[PDB]
Design a protein around this nucleic acid. Structure first.
Lengths: 56, 131, 272, 102, 86
RNA sequence: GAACUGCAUCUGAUACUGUUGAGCUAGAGUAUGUGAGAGGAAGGUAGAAUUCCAGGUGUAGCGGUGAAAUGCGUAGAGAUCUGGAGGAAUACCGAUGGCGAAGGCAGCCUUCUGGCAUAAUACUGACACUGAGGCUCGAAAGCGUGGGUAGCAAACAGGAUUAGAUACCCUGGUAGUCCACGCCGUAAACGAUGUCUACUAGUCGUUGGGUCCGGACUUAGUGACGCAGCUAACGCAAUAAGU
């Protein structure tokens, strides 16, 4: 329905163990929702909500 | 853009005949209808009817003929294209396939066959060759 | 900006003059002006202490309010004026009380702008503030070396200083030269770069142009005789020995600094 | 235009975080500004340390104001020196529903 | 940008008929106003070639419509260019 | 006799073209609502990583190669760890995906900005296509002035193999690549395929919308196969190289 950068609990499942973005071939998301999810993940990364990498 | 109408009608007929279509429809004009009527009178197409649609438009529908599996229209070629107009006298009209074809001639007495124009002693624009 | 001349003479083919229409053409305030007689590069004894100084055109001196003592008073710049003493332009300040002073003009300045002084003030060009108040990463000019002595560094046209960091009671500043030195925190600074940034790209065009500024010709040592310079003498053109000044002090790469007291102030020197 | 602002604040300034918020609200009100939402998430834990602090305070609010006021507000964010990070996004439609975190 | 209000204002001034929004005069006036607005932006940013291409297309379209109007009715064309300072 | 296909003159014909008077919407446009995007320009800022610097722990190697040597190291390197300073690029997302007339365009927010897609209305009523000259843009390298300079690296230095090695490998390394403003106007600038139209079986993809009951339908792009047709043959094949 809608994707937001504030929803960290919904990005937790879509983000990889080390902090990388899981691809669409694995998740099964639509291209549009994937673009929005990538942008939201980048915003939560810049707002210190999700880690860039596991080892900082 | 579309800078030719008679050529468009001729190529529509030719493509429909190559695709073995029963009938071909196009936007209608009086010149297109006259050419289709000449084709009908020469026996190259079964019939040609203009259905007046809405918005002051009309559809010219031509029913095509096929003889022994092959198309009746063996070849149909534009001659007087917009880029190069061809006008001929009474004794200069080209003969199509030794006369076994038809050279459509738009004369001052209407759009008629080359042999009929030769009989009338008249000339005009040699628009197409159909055989 | 730079404005080239037309090559209508052998001396105009390479003249370039900086153009500034915004500055006021009219004369400055009479009271501030003071006479500045030329000394011809001569001391009281009359000996030529400094070479290649003389002639020139007489220039009045403009009093400059380096200290900016009048804190907590709004001032506006009625006009901006060219100064012959210093390359940087001088902006007149007319205070609310009516007092008139001259200050170095920042490049990002306009007529009628509001300027404030003291501890409390906005961070805008033309505003003098303590290094304590000034935040890090902000371009500054007219730095004050000693508290209450007035601004000394970055008074030249287009001068800039960057406040990299604050440690203890000192502020670390990066200068255009590349040399970093501690500055006591209480000392004040002015935000914004100095005006006339293009001054360096002008070409004076002919000999008389420097003779109007007061620079006399310079004679090379190789052109003189041994009695005159360590470089004189020789049949034909010749240099002879490691280059030096007339007084026997090598000019190429010799380090002449003797300041033990400020060695501690000097943090580091940029290498290039 | 509608602008959604996320502010990150230093834990020593967590005590004073409130007053600067009323200051911002007053500045936004003065210049034809309406604040739809003021979320106060609390002392969230940072995923990675920023400026040698593990945990920092989070504040969020949505404001409708003109660009000049927005630029002034950005200058205040730059010069506050407590607020390490700010995210002034722009939203086509004002957001009034409660934040998921709060 | 030209706002919703001022676009309709230009339309209303240049109406030949009721809510036409399609005559050459209205088209040219809207183009001229949009050029006037765009010029201030284009002065600020010299190297915006991708936008300048669209503005050049705007100029070309206005020229085509003005020439067509001149060929159609000369009085309308002269009045329109007199009003728009072209 | 014919022919001298012409030339001017009046006379007629009005299908077509040219010049015109009135009208129509189906080509092209315009107004409103929406959605998509690394379209462009200006600033800010976030995180890994390289480099140098200032320290602590610590000892005889590190680096590299097919094997080595130049190089760094007992003046404490490499490894590890804490502090800074400075430049460039933007992993993952990422996909014969998306945008742009081409050239090209990838982190994130903001300001300004040109196109395209579709939705039903309301509008003008041939305003259209192409384009000699002309002008606008135009990768990389290069040039001029001014800044910046981590990585990489033409040139240059030294180490190697070699009969020689003005090279491939190597240890360094300046211009350049980065920024502002101007020149340069050339690329295998390619789809080796000029632009714009109408027509001509079908199939499975995929991006952005629309409409229906997860599917069916339709739109402008985006690919892979495959008829008729074309081609010297490769192959092209509704995104034609077919008519």
């Amino acid at each position: 329905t809608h994707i937001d950068y504030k929803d960290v609990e919904l990005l937790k499942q879509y983000i990889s163990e080390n902090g990388k973005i899981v691809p669409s071939r694995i998740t099964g998301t639509s291209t549009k929702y994937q673009r929005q999810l990538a942008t939201a993940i980048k915003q939560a990364r810049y707002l210190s909500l999700l880690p860039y990498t596991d080892n900082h | 853009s579309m800078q030719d109408t008679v050529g468009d009608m001729l190529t529509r007929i030719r493509n429909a005949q190559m695709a073995n279509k029963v009938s071909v429809a196009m936007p209608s004009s009086k010149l297109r209808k006259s050419i289709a009527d000449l084709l009908v009178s020469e026996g190259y197409v079964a019939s040609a009817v203009v259905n007046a649609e809405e918005n002051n438009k009309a559809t010219l529908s031509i029913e095509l003929k096929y003889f022994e599996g092959k198309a009746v229209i063996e070849t149909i070629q534009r001659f007087s294209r917009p880029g190069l107009r061809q006008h001929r006298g009474k004794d200069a009209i080209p003969t199509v396939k030794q006369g076994m074809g038809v050279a459509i001639v738009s004369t001052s007495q209407g759009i008629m066959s080359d042999r009929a124009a030769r009989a009338a002693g008249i000339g005009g624009e040699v628009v197409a060759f159909v055989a | 900006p730079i404005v080239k001349a037309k090559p209508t003479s052998p001396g105009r083919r390479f003249v370039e003059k900086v153009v500034h229409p915004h500055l006021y053409k009219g004369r400055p305030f009479a009271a501030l002006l003071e006479s500045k007689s030329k000394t011809g590069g001569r001391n009281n004894n009359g000996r030529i202490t400094t070479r290649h100084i003389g002639g020139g055109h007489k220039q009045h001196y403009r009093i400059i309010d380096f200290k900016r003592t009048k804190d907590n008073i709004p001032a506006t710049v009625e006009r901006i004026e060219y100064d012959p003493n210093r390359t940087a332009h001088i902006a007149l300040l007319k205070y609310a009380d009516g007092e008139r002073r001259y200050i170095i003009a920042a490049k990002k300045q306009a007529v009628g702008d509001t300027v404030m002084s003291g501890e409390a003030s906005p961070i805008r060009p033309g505003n003098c503030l303590p290094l304590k108040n000034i935040p890090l990463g902000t371009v500054i000019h007219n730095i004050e070396l000693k508290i209450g002595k007035g601004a000394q560094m970055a008074r030249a046209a287009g001068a800039s200083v960057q406040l990299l960091g604050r440690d203890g009671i000192y502020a670390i500043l990066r200068l255009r030269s590349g040399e970093t030195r501690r500055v006591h925190v209480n000392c004040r600074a002015v935000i914004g770069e100095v005006s006339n940034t293009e001054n360096n790209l002008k070409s004076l065009g002919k000999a008389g142009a420097s003779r109007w500024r007061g620079i006399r010709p310079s004679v090379r040592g190789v052109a003189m005789n041994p009695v005159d310079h360590p470089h004189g003498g020789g049949e034909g053109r010749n240099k002879g020995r490691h280059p030096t000044s007339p007084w026997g002090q090598k000019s190429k790469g010799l380090k002449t600094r003797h300041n033990k007291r400020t060695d501690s102030m000097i943090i580091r020197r940029a290498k290039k | 235009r509608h602008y959604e602002v996320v502010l990150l604040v230093h834990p020593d300034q967590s005590d004073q975080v409130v007053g600067m918020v009323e200051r911002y609200i007053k500045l936004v009100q003065d210049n034809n500004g309406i604040i739809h939402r003021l979320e106060d998430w609390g002392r969230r834990q940072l995923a990675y340390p920023i400026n040698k602090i593990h945990k920092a305070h989070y504040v969020l609010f949505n404001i409708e104001t003109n660009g000049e006021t927005l630029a002034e507000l950005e200058e205040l964010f730059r010069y506050n020196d407590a607020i390490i990070r700010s995210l002034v996004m722009r939203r086509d439609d004002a957001i009034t529903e409660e934040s998921q975190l709060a | 940008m030209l706002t919703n209000s001022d676009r309709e204002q230009i339309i209303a001034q240049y109406q030949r008929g009721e809510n036409d929004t399609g005559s050459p005069e209205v088209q040219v006036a809207l183009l001229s106003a949009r050029i006037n607005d765009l010029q201030n932006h284009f002065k600020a940013h010299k190297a915006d070639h991708h936008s300048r291409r669209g503005l050049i297309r705007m100029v070309n379209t206005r020229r085509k419509l003005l020439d067509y109007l001149k060929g159609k009715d000369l009085g309308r064309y002269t009045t329109l260019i007199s009003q728009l300072g072209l």
